[PDB]
Nucleic acid binder design. Structure first.
Ligand SMILES: [As]
Ligand SMILES: [As]
Ligand SMILES: [As]
Ligand SMILES: [As]
Ligand SMILES: [Zn+2]
Ligand SMILES: [Zn+2]
Ligand SMILES: [Zn+2]
Ligand SMILES: [Zn+2]
Lengths: 198, 198, 198, 198
DNA sequence: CGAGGAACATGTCCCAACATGTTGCTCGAG
DNA sequence: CTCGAGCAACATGTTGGGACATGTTCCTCG
């Protein structure tokens, strides 16, 4: 009631998410772990998420992205950037400095603040795949480390991506855990390799 | 001269309770012992209780939660927080500081005080399971240790969850014993392991 | 918030403190450890402190007793009783319920609350030793355990006894650490025996 | 482009600094390394510095304390608390939240902010040693870790203590390096033991 | 150069140990 | 036949510090 749904819902347009499978290096900047359904992303580093749909949705549909804290203790608290990072000037003009999740290189972006929950989100209108493509990509990037004292303060978060009509109705939903850190490469291996033993 | 009924009553909507109980660690924060029908919960730690129903109940139905002391000597006394804990500021805004049981992350919550019995309770309107889910979860948390001098003072309590219509009528009821303590992990094992011998 | 001096000062009247050396039992209620200069006292149990003086001081001299927290972190905070204990009715009429240190069986006692510091103290006029005695005794007792959640909260305290003239001047000062606990006997041995090793 | 002098100057009153030599434990909160002339202090932990003087200075003399960054690159920058720590409410009323160095339990304290340099300091009037004592102690505590992102940001600092007359003149000066950290014990040993090898 | 990957620096966490109040269990009295 | 005083045993919250977590620096090498 106070905490956005995290439930996967492919909807009637077959809304699914994809990620660029890389990892053949060690000095990696952004990577995805299908086992953990978790993305390992460096701070303020562009990372493509791609949208897949069986059918094309009607014009006026938008995709919003919103972080929530994963653990139940913290769910209720709003995910914002840390005092340090909001005050240091790194904006791209458009993005309010307090917002964690911004969208790179999309002029029709809007940064929003729900009047009831107070959560931040970032919405962009849906575009269908370009000709000769199977998916639309959004380039998000996250503007704090997970360990930022005063912000996420070492707590893991989820990123929920919804597909919504003009009127704000839900057409589909997906989610994935995110860890923003200095060494995605290292943190990637450690977590997957810790999983094998257990 | 009135203690609420503690009797299990699944009612005509098949009201039952479920718990995660996942554990598998030692540093556990919340766990459930089916053998003891008891929950072991840390102080102010979110712990999911989930509601199961054969049929969906009519709109306007609400679920209330209320603590009573388990032992017969004490049943009659009202379960409230200790002097220390009511006066220390830890409220979430909504929850009156004297109330033991609060509900995390539900905006339509109400904290009540029965004009006849004087017992506290916390009610939230019933929501059916989200699509592709079998149960509705509530996230309670308990705001004093069981051993709190001046409150429960080392006396065990029960938590009674009822399902009620708008008008206050009973549609179903369940209950489980609760121990709020610093070390749920330890206290869990001890009690189960003490049970085997006897 | 400035802190009363803790400095020993025997002054020009040779103000010293004495205690009844007992300990030949295990079920002890009040005992003194010269090594630690610490008293081990049960809650609300009368314990004699005795005053020794080389010279007799002028009429109108008073002795006040005041607790402060020992550690430097906490010195600044005023020592009061816990929420449980102030609200439970155990007063002897004279003693305000918030005051930690009271004096047994002295009708001319006064309980003071400094309008600037807010510290409590308990003053009684000085009487010289009775004929054929070498010291005057005061019977203090402490109205909370050291471990009282919401009060001293496991922090050790000092008790400062000053000898003051009518005009408020300092004539002498002494101090001793106090631990109020359920088992003085046990807590006595443990601390002395732990001192040897270190 | 004006950095306060760091030069030791014992002056005509023989102004020197002393520290409580402890360290017989591992879980240490505040310690001093004579070799390094450095103090290892936990965050917001009271730590005594003591003033020694051959002769007593005239009434109206004050002692001020001021942090500056040690390295030459950074000297020029003002030492303040981090964005997280200034905004979190932990004040004792008197201390402005941005000030790094505060003084515990002295009511005549003043927090100063130089209209030209913008440096912070904390001044308290000098008191001579209490009777039967060889030094006056001040209880400082530092309100950020050395590693605080957005504040000192892992850069070491110096603490300069001056002895000044009413009129603002210099009567004496001393200094010592400070590291505020979570584990003073560990960080103490590491640095002394690293010194041997080099 | 700097890209890469150690090693380093630095704050947290886990849980056995410890601390501390309470409830048995035992055995010599009124 | 009990009954209570005094310890052992238990109950329960807190601590201590080695192992982790996590960002930053710093040598090695195409
Ligand atoms: As990414
Ligand atoms: As729970
Ligand atoms: As005593
Ligand atoms: As210190
Ligand atoms: Zn940040
Ligand atoms: Zn409580
Ligand atoms: Zn108390
Ligand atoms: Zn800081």
């Amino acid at each position: 009631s106070s905490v956005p749904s995290q439930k996967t819902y492919q909807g009637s347009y077959g809304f699914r998410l994809g990620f660029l499978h890389s990892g053949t290096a060690k000095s990696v900047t952004c990577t995805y772990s299908p086992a953990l359904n978790k993305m390992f992303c460096q701070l303020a580093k562009t990372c493509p998420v791609q949208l897949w749909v069986d059918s094309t949705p009607p014009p006026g549909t938008r995709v919003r992205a919103m972080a929530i804290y994963k653990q139940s203790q913290h769910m209720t608290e709003v995910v914002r950037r840390c005092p340090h990072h909001e005050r240091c000037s790194d904006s791209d003009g458009l993005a309010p400095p307090q917002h964690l999740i911004r969208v790179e290189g999309n002029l029709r972006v809007e940064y929003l603040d729900d009047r009831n929950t107070f959560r931040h989100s970032v919405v962009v209108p849906y575009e269908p795949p370009e000709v000769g493509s199977d998916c639309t990509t959004i380039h998000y990037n996250y503007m704090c480390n997970s360990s930022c004292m005063g912000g996420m303060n070492r707590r893991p978060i989820l990123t929920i991506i919804t597909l919504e009509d003009s009127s704000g109705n839900l057409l589909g939903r997906n989610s994935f855990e995110v860890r923003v850190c200095a060494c995605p490469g290292r943190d990637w291996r450690t977590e997957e390799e810790n999983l094998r033993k257990k």
